[PDB]
Design a protein around this ligand. Structure first.
Ligand code: SAM
Ligand code: MD0
Ligand code: SF4
Length: 337
């Protein structure tokens, strides 16, 4: 009945969030996943959207405590040349993606002269013609406006948490309202916006509710949750979370809270097997799919130690077929834009 109630317009209360978020039993969790699939199937059927991830520069000037690419970490870093971007684009044409996500750290090269980023968006839009999600960090409003004019469609700029006590330990040195304000500015210029929270990073149930309610206030087009994977060389490298607040539970709660929105199943956390679990918890778009071949990186990189990664669209679509799901039509995706 819970899925039916939501389909009809029921708004989950804070008591409902507490109850859903504290579910621990196999049967309870299966009833929560089933409810979220009812809601997702009502609005999306068995059709799934596919987003390619192009991490085009792994340089960052910021010092996030959770992220492998924080500026204090002495690691391998790359910055794709124009020729490498064009070669990557050639491998994506006609592959079946609905959108491409052009992501970078806050790379000083692109921040010193943001016309270099605007030209990168123009080249990719000219090559692919597809909807483009940008994840450039907190770029200034003038650059956001120029990138919109070159064909950027989505801005992904995740808040991580709306619990202020936690945000300042995670996004060290970054304004809390700066990110909120940039998503608002981008919506005014016509972008769709994705917000996101991290779980497994010391958020308890109350912190998670504050973050779910914080995400809803701004009317995002896409909402996500990622499991924190502690990374080598960061301040949080040893962190162990003592919580039941799994990404799958929160995906189902997001579907019940944002029934009509996009919610990702990311390959970056648990790969294709993890994708199955996330789609069965209510997700409707598969992200962190890499270009065919590709030495390109994800962000959490659950598969950093594997001799062979399984991140390509053809493996994703094969697994959706096994699940009884199918890629969506492009026009259905464009309807969200
Ligand atoms: C793809 S965005 C990068 C864009 C730009 N640098 C930024 O911070 O907005 C990185 C996000 O990846 C996720 N992330 C980073 N490190 C992670 C980790 N160790 N585990 C899980 N998610 C992580 C976070 O939600 C952070 O918002
Ligand atoms: C975190 C990344 C996305 C950033 N906008 C990508 N690895 C993902 O999981 O979708
Ligand atoms: S999350 Fe984004 S801003 Fe923070 S260190 Fe990682 S790449 Fe840089």
């Amino acid at each position: 009945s819970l899925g039916d109630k939501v389909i009809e317009g029921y708004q989950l209360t804070d008591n409902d969030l507490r109850t859903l978020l504290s579910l621990e039993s196999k049967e309870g969790l299966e009833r929560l996943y089933s409810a979220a699939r009812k809601v997702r199937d009502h609005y999306f059927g068995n059709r799934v959207f596919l987003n390619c991830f192009i991490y085009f520069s792994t340089y960052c000037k910021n010092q996030c405590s959770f992220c492998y690419y924080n500026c204090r970490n002495e690691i391998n870093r790359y910055r794709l040349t124009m020729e490498e971007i064009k070669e990557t684009c050639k491998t994506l044409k006609g592959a079946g993606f609905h959108m491409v996500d052009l992501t970078m750290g806050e790379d000083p090269y692109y921040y010193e002269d943001p016309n270099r980023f605007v030209e990168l968006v123009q080249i990719v839009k000219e090559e692919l013609g597809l909807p483009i999600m940008i994840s450039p960090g907190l770029m200034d409003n003038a650059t956001l406006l120029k990138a919109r004019e070159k064909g950027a469609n989505f801005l992904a700029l995740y808040q991580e948490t709306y619990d202020t006590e936690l945000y300042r330990k995670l996004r060290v040195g970054q304004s809390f309202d700066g990110r909120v304000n940039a998503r608002r500015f981008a919506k005014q210029q016509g972008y769709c916006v994705e917000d996101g929270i991290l779980t497994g990073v010391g958020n308890d149930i109350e912190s998670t509710i504050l973050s779910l309610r914080g995400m809803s206030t701004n009317d995002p087009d896409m909402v996500r949750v990622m499991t924190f994977l502690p990374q080598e060389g960061t301040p949080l490298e040893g962190f162990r979370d003592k919580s039941n607040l799994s990404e799958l539970k929160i995906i189902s709660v997001l579907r019940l809270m944002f029934p009509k929105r996009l919610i990702p199943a990311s390959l970056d956390l648990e790969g294709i097997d993890g994708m199955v679990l996330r789609l069965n918890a209510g997700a409707n778009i598969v992200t962190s799919i890499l270009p065919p071949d590709s030495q390109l990186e994800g962000v959490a990189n659950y598969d950093r130690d594997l001799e062979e990664r399984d991140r390509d669209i053809k493996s994703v679509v094969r697994r959706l077929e096994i699940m009884g799901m199918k890629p969506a039509r492009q026009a259905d995706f464009e309807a969200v834009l």
